[PDB]
Design a binder for this molecule. Structure first.
Ligand SMILES: CCCCCCCCCCCCCC
Ligand SMILES: CCCCCCCCCCCCCC
Ligand SMILES: CCCCCCCC
Ligand SMILES: CCCCCCCC
Ligand SMILES: [K+]
Ligand SMILES: [K+]
Ligand SMILES: [K+]
Lengths: 262, 262
């Protein structure tokens, strides 16, 4: 009934809350870096006294645009190749999965045209693949065992459904957040558990903001195999998430909530 | 029946197709830029003959990391502020909407911890808001008029549903892709219709790869109002997309397909 307006107001106010706290958290840091660059650049020109400021600007602009794409001039402009076939496979999985990883400017002019045609057919297609798998998977993982819980012990399905949903909710977080976060943290030599879990969450959830992809390690050994394994893991984790989500919707308490709310 | 395996093989082969074409499209361009930096940096050191290469590396690394975050040293390190309250509001809407816009490294250490707690409660919440609105909206926009089409002219609902779905599919693309792409293209002075439509598609779809957000224009006048209007537009466009998607699922031909497929 009228409560629907309450949800909209609460949600929009929640968004405002998120915005203000994000600004407070990131404003002193960004200001600190801004001040740091505003002294470092000036210092560079000061001590050298041999280089000109307008002339430096063209070089800085070109390199910065290059790093916006994702190619760095560091290491004699010879870092780990960024657009090899394997990384492209990770990129395609992340576009279809809607995680959308990539750099500040991800694709060149021609590649933005192609993405549109590729994705516009491949999003309903991947969605069709995902729904079919969760459908087939959910019957085997969740509905059929609930019947086993219902037949052998002969007690209320609703009690089983809540308990089954929570236990599944725990295993998937255990198996697909805590364990992978540990794996990535030990593997990558520049991360810790919090940051690795951040990547896990932002990957299994389809946010995928920015890039922040494990694999940018210089002189990585099995970079290709790593890339293809984190792609299969990503897609499959989205399935597991899209199964625990499905079971929660089936629950009487949650499905009743949405209907009573409306 | 067995056809399910055919879908999985076709989908995975489709992903491989996307990867190879993406690599071919982006490999010569990235190589060209890589070669260009591999001559430009060397030229810079050559003509100046006053600056040292290892000493330059620290400065380049610091600035490049700063631009990975999204703060540029250009314009005397005083460009349009990036983390003001309004931009943060756009960022929060894009995290909840799962579009995930942001730079190569979007958030500092503290802000990655906060995002997890904020999003983990706010994704089921925004999802709950979205489903409620499409539910209420769909009845008014689609079901009730279909009844008008069904009562007044008294002919097959299925014919109406297909025709109604296509017409709705046309209006929303007309109203929320072609028109906004035109608006952004004329507004922003550095884009054209193709690129603007690319942003529209990647925004209404939850991909949102990289950043590529209109608003980075230097000396923008009404940047704040622009930011808040493109946030309301983004969220609302996701609603319209999540309504045309819903109506297509209702169609007998499409719902039959998924069931016959399974
Ligand atoms: C790829 C299909 C569309 C997007 C699906 C997004 C699912 C998000 C699930 C979030 C689960 C809860 C995380 C805390
Ligand atoms: C909002 C959170 C769940 C994800 C919904 C994604 C919807 C994608 C719609 C794509 C429509 C393409 C039309 C041509
Ligand atoms: C029960 C079918 C699972 C299929 C998983 C495919 C992962 C690429
Ligand atoms: C029919 C209700 C529409 C609500 C729109 C809210 C936009 C922020
Ligand atoms: K995304
Ligand atoms: K998404
Ligand atoms: K994204």
């Amino acid at each position: 009934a009228w409560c629907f307006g309450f949800l909209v107001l609460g949600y929009l106010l929640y968004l405002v809350f998120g915005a203000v706290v994000f600004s407070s958290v990131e404003l002193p840091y960004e200001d600190l870096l801004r001040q740091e660059l505003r002294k470092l650049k000036r210092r560079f020109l000061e001590e050298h006294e041999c280089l000109s400021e307008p002339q430096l600007e063209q070089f800085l602009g070109r390199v910065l645009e290059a790093s916006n794409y994702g190619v760095s001039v560091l290491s004699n402009a010879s870092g780990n190749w960024n657009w090899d076939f394997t990384s492209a496979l990770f990129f395609a999985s992340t576009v279809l999965s809607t995680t959308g990883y990539g750099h500040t400017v991800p694709l060149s002019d021609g590649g933005k045209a192609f993405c549109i045609i590729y994705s516009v057919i491949g999003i309903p297609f991947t969605l069709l693949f995902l729904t079919a798998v969760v459908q087939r998977v959910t019957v085997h993982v969740t509905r059929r065992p609930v019947l086993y819980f219902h037949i052998r012990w002969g007690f209320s399905k609703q009690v089983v459904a809540i308990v089954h949903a929570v236990l599944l909710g725990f295993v998937t977080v255990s198996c697909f957040f805590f364990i992978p976060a540990a794996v990535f943290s030990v593997l990558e030599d520049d991360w810790n558990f919090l940051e690795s879990f951040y990547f896990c969450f932002i990957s299994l959830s389809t946010i995928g903001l920015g890039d922040y992809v494990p694999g940018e390690g210089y002189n990585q050994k099995f970079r290709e195999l790593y890339k293809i394994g984190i792609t299969c893991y990503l897609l499959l984790g989205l399935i597991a998430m899209l199964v625990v989500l499905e079971t929660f919707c089936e629950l009487h308490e949650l499905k009743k909530f949405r209907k009573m709310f409306y």
